[PDB]
Design a protein around this ligand. Sequence first.
Ligand code: NI
Ligand code: NI
Ligand code: NI
Ligand code: NI
Lengths: 84, 82, 83, 80
Amino acid sequence: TQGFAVLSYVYEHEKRDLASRIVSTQHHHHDLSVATLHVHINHDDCLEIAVLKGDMGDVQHFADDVIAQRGVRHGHLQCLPKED
Amino acid sequence: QGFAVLSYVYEHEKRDLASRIVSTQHHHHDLSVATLHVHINHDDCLEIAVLKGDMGDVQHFADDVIAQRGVRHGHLQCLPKE
Amino acid sequence: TQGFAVLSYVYEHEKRDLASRIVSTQHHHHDLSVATLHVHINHDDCLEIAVLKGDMGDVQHFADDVIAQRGVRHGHLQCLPKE
Amino acid sequence: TQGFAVLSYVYEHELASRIVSTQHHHHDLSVATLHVHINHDDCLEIAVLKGDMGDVQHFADDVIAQRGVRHGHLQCLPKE
Ligand code: NI
Ligand code: NI
Ligand code: NI
Ligand code: NI
C-alpha cells in the first residue's frame, strides 16, 4: 500500500537531544518526508506537522518511532493510502 | 506594521547552530507565524519562516537568525502593510 | 477553552468553486488561521493542512463547516486544547 | 543544473484556484506550499520547488507574471 500521511506532535525545543533526534530521523528517512510545518506555539513548545509519502508500512513504522519517544506529546497519525 | 518571509539553509547536525536558530525564533515567537522545513539532502535543511509585526522588530529578529555562524543563503523579504 | 488544532483534508483543485470557497471561508475566519500547508499530491488532488488557533468550540464549528462542503474528502480535525 | 527554489508571492484570492491548478500542471516540480491568509483579501504563499532550474524559472513565470500577482520573488538554490 503506497500513500501519504500526516504526522503531528508537540515537543519542547530546549530538550536538545530529542529535537536533534526528530530532525535527524527525518533526514535518515528523508525519502519518506515531503515537508514539515512548524509552529513555535509558545516560548517552550513546538507543534510540528510532517507530511510523509511512501509505503504505508514504512510510514507507520517511522511515525511510531517518533511518537514513542519520551518528550513527544500529542503524537498523531492520519494515514492516506492510495485511492483507486 | 507588516509580514516578512525569512529563508535560509543550515546543517542540522551543527548542534549549537540548530539550537540557536530555533531558540532565537522562540524568544520572538510573538513575531513568528509558522515555518516550513524541507530536508533538501542528508546534511542540509531549508527553512522558510513567515514573520509578522513591527518592521523594525522583524528585521532585527531576522538579522539575529541570519547572522548566526553556519546559516547560509539567508534572505529576508519584507512586506510592510499596504 | 482555547487551544490549537490541525485540520486536514483532500480536494480536487479542478472542482474549484470549492477551492475558492475553501480559501474564502478561511479568510472570513482568518483570526482562527495560523497557516496552511498544501501538497499537490497528484495531478488531481490536493492535501491541505490548516493550523488553527482559538476557542476549541469555534474551531470545531469552523472545521465541521469546511468538511461538510461537497468534494472535501478525508476531513480530519486533531484538537490540541491548551494543557 | 538541478536544485531547489523558493517562490513567494502575494495575491487576492477572490486567482487562488487558478494558481493552484497552475502548480498542479508542474506538480513534479513542487515540494509543498505554505499559505498565510494575511488579511481579508490577500494571501501570502511560498512554494518550495525542486528540479531543473530551467523548469523552475519556467514554473515561476506561469505564476509571477500573472495579472494580480504581487510581491513575487524567486530564490534559486542550485545544488552545491
Ligand atoms: Ni518551535
Ligand atoms: Ni531538515
Ligand atoms: Ni494542490
Ligand atoms: Ni489566503
